[PDB]
Amino acid sequence: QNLKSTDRAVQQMLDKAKREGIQTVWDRYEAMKPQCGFGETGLCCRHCLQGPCRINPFGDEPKVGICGATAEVIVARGLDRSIAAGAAGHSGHAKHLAHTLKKAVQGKAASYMIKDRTKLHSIAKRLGIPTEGQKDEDIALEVAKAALADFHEKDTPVLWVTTVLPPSRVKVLSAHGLIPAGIDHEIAEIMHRTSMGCDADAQNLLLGGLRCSLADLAGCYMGTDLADILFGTPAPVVTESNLGVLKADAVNVAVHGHNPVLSDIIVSVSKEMENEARAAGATGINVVGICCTGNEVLMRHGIPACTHSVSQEMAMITGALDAMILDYQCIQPSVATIAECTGTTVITTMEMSKITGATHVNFAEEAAVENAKQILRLAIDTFKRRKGKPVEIPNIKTKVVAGFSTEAIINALSKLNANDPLKPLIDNVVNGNIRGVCLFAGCNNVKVPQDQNFTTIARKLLKQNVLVVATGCGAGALMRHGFMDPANVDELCGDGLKAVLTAIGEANGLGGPLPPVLHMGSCVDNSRAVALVAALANRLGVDLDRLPVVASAAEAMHEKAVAIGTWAVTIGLPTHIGVLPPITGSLPVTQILTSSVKDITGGYFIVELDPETAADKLLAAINERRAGLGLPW
């Protein structure tokens, strides 16, 4: 089972699933092998009814698509559609939150409100919306309106790009025609250009992809901004992770998906319903997180994280998961069927994301509390039904310190330098105590033993004094393996990094360090890393492609992760991907994405499946940046 997951709790549940005959994602993977090599390499097209077309990577015919599409074109079109799909997900989540905010401040949904007034005003100032003499509800309405306006063409480009990067970066991107005109506009233009008999020049196609990846960035940044207004900007919080956060004697309710608009209300209403759960024989309602909706409520409220991506089914296998409350994205639809075996009540809530066999609740903001109580009552009923049934919850959990928004990082640093908070971080980059910064982002992927790349690469980087930050299932991996527990700083961190984490931690009164890795939140909250890195670039008076900052989507899976990797490259970062995207069928496309794009944006992909090698390549990238700033390395 160690060949499937490096998480011991997952291994334990994989043994239980096997003896019970419950098929898992890893079983379904095994049943799929050998996988199609045309698709793996990107040399397949189904963009018209003359296909499917394929191209042999090597050898004889077929060499070209039926319409004449080359390997270059086919690979680039496929990639562009994945970027557009990722942009559609992040920006759909953001759009939904914009509508929520509008409802809140129009008095249409009293369960929602402006929680973070400081965030609201800062965003309005970033955007150039006046605040002086305006009511908060009106400033919010303006913010929501501006968010919605970034989805279509208008007299300005997408402000959730141009107002979040430094002018010198915007100027480089503008020069190459890369600034998006509108989020849904770009998504549609990708779908058009990639359709049969349209764009058929790899460079042109890939420039379009880069632009659409910035539309994805805008969606991410918008989603973080709006969720912080509605639900609060995260600050440091202490919690736990892994399956051992489940409790046999409680009603265990997982919140799973990405948009926390209802799950944030579930957290608050569950508390209210404690005496009702006790009436049903439970100690209370124990809300736990899966995936990014889990990350959202972890970051804001300290809700413990149960599990992430690839291992999500394992929470059900314990027998103790009374309900799984779903929004959208990254939910294996197997959960609906596994529920028949495990007894879990799986509940969908969003109109555009249903799963055959799951019970659907028509969530509406105006009815959010009513919805939450209905859902929680189903969970309580489910808990009652498992009266007397043994459960098998692995007694495995880690301590997690999280909540490191960019605001929180800047505040923590300000305890070392109140009026120039970034300076202590830069001072330590310069003196070598911090070698650089690495963002771990993205998924787990069944192809890679769960967490192995994230932990292998992080361990090497941390020993080499890299400041590591993480989001999404990268954060999930690292938290489940102890990288968010400050007790592990001595073991994991190089001396320079330890000194910095300790100095910041002791200035924040902790009597001890920051954790080894800073959890910056959900997948949209990759935008928080952009804010930090843009702030550093502006403080130094350089562009992002001069900073010793890299990214690693070490176990990438979703189209969303491909979009994030692509905008990381576009904003100027060396960006590792630890699974093969479907590009290797075209050497020219590979050479653009790994090499010639450096000349355009300064960033580039590093495609490397061996994690020890990837760590060495990431360090080399960091060190090349240091050398370009004239620093020792």
With the C-alpha atoms ordered 65, 67, 70, 75, is the resulting torsion angle positive or negative? negative
Q: Are strands 574-577 and 604-607 parallel, antiparallel or unpaired?
A: parallel
| d(C-alpha 86, C-alpha 161), whole Å | 16
Contact yes or no for 534/544 (Cβ under 8 A): yes
| Gyration radius of the chain over CA positions | 24
Comparing CB distances to ligand FES, the nearer of 70 and 131 is 70
DSSP conformation class of 365: G
Residue 69 sits in the site that holds ligand SF4 (CB under 6 A): yes
What residues contact residue 317 under an 8 Å CB cut-off, 6+ apart? 13, 16, 17, 20, 22, 338, 342, 392
Comparing CB distances to ligand SF4, the nearer of 355 and 425 is 355
Q: How far is the CB of 321 from ligand SF4 (least distance, A)?
A: 22
| d(C-alpha 555, C-alpha 43), whole Å | 22
The type of residue at 87 is A
Contacting ligand SF4 (CB under 6 A), which of 8, 18, 23, 48? 48
Region binding ligand SF4 by CB under 6 A among candidate stretches 45-53, 105-113, 235-243, 471-479:
45-53
Residue 512 sits in the site that holds ligand FES (CB under 6 A): no
Q: How far is the CB of 55 from ligand FES (least distance, A)?
A: 10
> Choosing among a second copy, ligand SF4, Fe ion, none, which partner's interface includes residue 78 (Cβ < 5 to 8 Å by kind)?
a second copy
| d(C-alpha 231, C-alpha 292), whole Å | 15
| d(C-alpha 250, C-alpha 376), whole Å | 12
Residue 248 sits in the site that holds ligand SF4 (CB under 6 A): no
Contacting ligand SF4 (CB under 6 A), which of 53, 159, 243, 262? 53
| d(C-alpha 300, C-alpha 632), whole Å | 39
527: nearest Cα among 422, 441, 629: 441
Residue 135 sits in the site that holds ligand SF4 (CB under 6 A): no
87: nearest Cα among 552, 580, 445, 561: 561
Q: How far is the CB of 339 from a second copy (least distance, A)?
A: 12
- Flag whether 493 is marked binding: no
> Choosing among ligand FES, Fe ion, a second copy, none, which partner's interface includes residue 352 (Cβ < 5 to 8 Å by kind)?
a second copy
What residues contact residue 495 under an 8 Å CB cut-off, 6+ apart? 465
- Flag whether 438 is marked binding: no
Residue 47 sits in the site that holds ligand FES (CB under 6 A): no
Comparing CB distances to ligand SF4, the nearer of 196 and 364 is 196
Contact yes or no for 284/251 (Cβ under 8 A): yes
Comparing CB distances to ligand SF4, the nearer of 247 and 447 is 447
> Choosing among Fe ion, ligand FES, a second copy, none, which partner's interface includes residue 152 (Cβ < 5 to 8 Å by kind)?
a second copy
Residue 39 sits in the site that holds ligand FES (CB under 6 A): yes
Binding mask 179-198 for ligand SF4 (x = CB under 6 A): -----------------x--
| d(C-alpha 633, C-alpha 618), whole Å | 13
Task: Give Cα 192 distance to the centre of its chain.
Answer: 27
Residue 81 sits in the site that holds ligand SF4 (CB under 6 A): no
Contacting Fe ion (CB under 5 A), which of 25, 412, 523, 532? 523
Interaction residues for ligand FES, span 159-188 (CB under 6 A): none
Residues that bind ligand FES (CB under 6 A): 36, 38-39, 44, 46, 52, 54
Residues that bind Fe ion (CB under 5 A): 292, 472, 523
